[PDB]
Amino acid sequence: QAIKCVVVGDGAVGKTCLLISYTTNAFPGEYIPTVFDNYSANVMVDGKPVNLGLWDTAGQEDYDRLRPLSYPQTDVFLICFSLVSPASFENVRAKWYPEVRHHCPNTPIILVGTKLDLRDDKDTIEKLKEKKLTPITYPQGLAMAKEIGAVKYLECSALTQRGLKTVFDEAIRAVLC
Amino acid sequence: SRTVDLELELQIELLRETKRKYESVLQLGRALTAHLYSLLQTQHALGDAFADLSQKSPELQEEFGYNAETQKLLCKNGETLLGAVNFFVSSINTLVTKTMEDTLMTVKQYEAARLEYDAYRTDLEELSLGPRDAGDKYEKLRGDVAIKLKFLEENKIKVMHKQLLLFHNAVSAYFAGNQKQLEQT
Amino acid sequence: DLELELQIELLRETKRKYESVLQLGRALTAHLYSLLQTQHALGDAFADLSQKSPELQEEFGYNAETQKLLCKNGETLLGAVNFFVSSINTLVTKTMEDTLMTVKQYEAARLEYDAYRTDLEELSLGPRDKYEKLRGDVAIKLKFLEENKIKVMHKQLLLFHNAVSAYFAGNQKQLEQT
Ligand SMILES: Nc1nc2c(ncn2[C@@H]2O[C@H](COP(=O)(O)OP(=O)(O)O)[C@@H](O)[C@H]2O)c(=O)[nH]1
Ligand SMILES: [Mg+2]
């Protein structure tokens, strides 16, 4: 079966690394592979052969006009936000939740917490406070999902794969219900 | 000892083969949508880079800017193309996924009834060969699929005609208004 | 010396942008290649349906020809785009390096003269000349490439644009040959 999954969310969140790590099991931090490329996958969702169509995007305002061009005929949105970026997390309601709904108000949404490793590290943890800010917790992300209407809320690290493989299994299940 | 509705079964094979081919087109269409969205974006980037380099290089200010404006014209025009292909893909998806599936749902019931009838009449024969004895569902279904196969073929022509006409036009209009200014900027 | 290191710092910002262009370049190649594969397969799928679907023979017919013509023309365009990026590459991976390398040789014997000055400066009053030779092969080497940049980018930028243009013209023409 064919399911179309679009990955949206503030740039820098890791939408591209999320998809390369998942589909190729490698981090793109090496040369930053082919720009604006999209990715597909074949997964077994419970004795079920599925053809996953993953659409990457660009969060910068410059593309606000040709971004919704990929939303038609979509089956499951994955609004992403960096757990290390409280700012990006705010735009989850400030920009994403609306835009996705502005076009397809009836499509399931999965909120993801990209970068679950740089949540307890010695570096950003300090400079995060340096800006009078702190990392995104389970709550307010778990409530953010509910504040929207997400069929699920997961977290993962495209650099550790922990929780990665799952994020999409949930995207698919959310589809065939 | 096998029941054959020649004309009907020939139509069924054709519907299955048609559905196979359309599903193939549907896949290609989807790919077409991906690649086109990938091509598009680039042209937006390229446009911007070339526009950048155009300002930071007077030696090549006219060369870079000539391209910038073209890679920018295309992009915009390739937004109208993408939209058209999505329309093509979803329209034919309704036809295959819903309308053709509804009929095949009836084609399967009829085939099941046809096979049960054959087994039934065969059981009867090998039962006569013994202590001696030589003295609806399938038919109702057979009639139900014929009607549906006809409604479906009618609707298939209409949907495909409209979609083949618009897809072609969209694909070519991505050259007409793309030429009158491709080098007129 | 300011001159050179103002000329170099620009020769890098430029080697960079031309890379960012070279990126968007292979990308364009990539996406273009795929799109052609799809149009090729789509034209065969349409030609086939045309032969089998007499009810929609024309519609599948003009759609296959179009896709086939588009694929054919796309080949040339691809060639061009490749020649582009390729050449732009030669100007970055080799020619520019050859220059960016002699700079490294220049930088090697660069701050060592500015260092040994302030260094062996403390040592004085109490109680070795080919440094410029490299300067030649870095100034005469440097802006001897700038002419080369111009010569290449000018030509390359024109072929590319013409190619893209030609694409749509060649398309629009034969597209009206029905
Ligand atoms: N440590 C860490 N860095 C990440 C992770 N995902 C992405 N990054 C980094 O975040 C930056 C932006 O990631 P990217 O995938 O390009 O974000 P995008 O705008 O959503 O495509 C890059 O420098 C990545 O190396 C992650 O899972 N862990
Ligand atoms: Mg990205």
Upper half-sphere CA count for residue B13 (Cβ side, 13 Å): 7
Q: Note whether C10 contacts B: Cβ–Cβ < 8 A.
A: no
Domain that residue A74 falls in: 1-177
CA distance A21 to A148: 27
Do residue A69 and residue B79 have CB atoms under 8 angstroms apart? yes
Residue keyed to tokens 């549907």:
B26
Q: Which of 3.80.30.20, 2.20.28.120, 3.30.70.20, 1.20.1270.60 is the CATH number of C1-178?
A: 1.20.1270.60
Query: Would an 8 Å CB–CB cutoff place B179 in contact with chain C?
Result: yes
Instruction: Report helix, strand or coil for A79.
Output: strand
Secondary structure letter of residue A109 according to DSSP: B
Ligand 2 center from residue C62 Cα (angstroms): 38
Measure the CA–CA gap between B71 and B185, rounded to whole angstroms.
Answer: 12
d(CA A128, ligand 1 centre) in Å: 17
C-alpha neighbours within 13 Å on the C-beta side of residue C164 = 25
Kindly tell me the sign of the dihedral angle through the C-alpha atoms of C51, C53, C59, C64. Answer: negative
Count of C-beta atoms within a 10 Å radius of residue A53: 21
Q: How many CB atoms lie within 10 A of CB C120?
A: 9
List Cα–Cα distances, C139 to B60, B109, C99, C146, in angstroms: 22, 85, 10, 11
Q: At what angle do helices B101-128 and B137-179 cross, to 10 degrees?
A: 150
Q: Is A3 helix (H, G, I), strand (E, B) or coil?
A: strand
| Burial class for C2, CB neighbours closer than 10 Å (0-12, 13-18, 19+) | exposed
Beta bridge partners of A4: A53
Cα dihedral C89, C93, C98, C102 sign: positive
Q: Which of A65, A57, A47, A81 is nearest to A4 (CA)?
A: A57
How far apart CA C90 and CA C67 sit, in angstroms, is: 34
Which residues 29-88 on chain C approach chain A with CB closer than 8 angstroms? 30-31
CA nearest ligand 1 atom 28, residue: A115
In single-letter form, the type of residue at position C13 comes to: E
Cβ pair C66, C175 in contact under 8 A: yes
Which ligand is the nearest neighbour of the Cα of A112? 1
Strand order in the sheet with A2-8: A39-44, A49-55, A2-8, A76-82, A110-114, A152-156
- The resolution in angstroms reads 2.7
**B6-55 and B101-128 helices, crossing angle to 10°:** 150
Strands, DSSP E only, in C90-158?
none
Residues with CB under 6 A from ligand 1: A 11-17, 29, 59, 115, 117-118, 157-159
Report the gap between the CA of C26 and the closest CA in chain A (Å): 8
CATH number at residue A14: 3.40.50.300
Residue with tokens 């709904």: A101
Does residue A23 contact residue A73 with C-beta atoms inside 8 Å? Answer: no
What's the domain count of chain A?
1
The CATH topology of domain B1-185 is Substrate Binding Domain Of Dnak; Chain:A; Domain 2 (1.20.1270)
For residue B92, count CB atoms less than 10 angstroms from its CB and return exposed for 0-12, middle for 13-18, buried for 19 or more: buried
For chain B, give the number of residues: 185
Q: Indicate the pairing of strand A39-44 with strand A49-55.
A: antiparallel
Q: Which of B21, B85, B166 is nearest to C47 (CA)?
A: B21
Closest residue by Cα to atom 6, ligand 1, is A14
Q: Burial level of B91, CB count in 10 A (0-12/13-18/19+)?
A: middle
